[PDB]
Design a protein around this ligand. Sequence first.
Ligand SMILES: [Cl-]
Ligand SMILES: [Cl-]
Length: 129
Amino acid sequence: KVFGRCELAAAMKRHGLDNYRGYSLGNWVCAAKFESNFNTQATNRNTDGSTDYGILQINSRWWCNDGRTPGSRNLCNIPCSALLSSDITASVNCAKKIVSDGNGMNAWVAWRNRCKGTDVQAWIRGCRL
Ligand SMILES: [Cl-]
Ligand SMILES: [Cl-]
């Protein structure tokens, strides 16, 4: 599923991401835009052989099991394919674990390089929330 901007903002708000660990809703929408272009089916292969999955591009090296990343962890206790569903619950629940691990949203390279230090509130402007 390819979300609209305000549609995704409302879905993330309902799932408790607004101000989660101090990150306002616009940060999460901005991260999803640049990680996946709002597409739940996005996948991308990394150089080390791991793969990033879903709207927030969660990495199989640490967070999910895809059966093809030897020596990796599965810290969210899910198959990586669950991160590609049109229902974002699994992605959001795993993202809450990632952002709590000490490095905040810096775990998302596109957030650090394209959202951090910008007017992220623009990403929710005009939305009924
Ligand atoms: Cl915001
Ligand atoms: Cl933080």
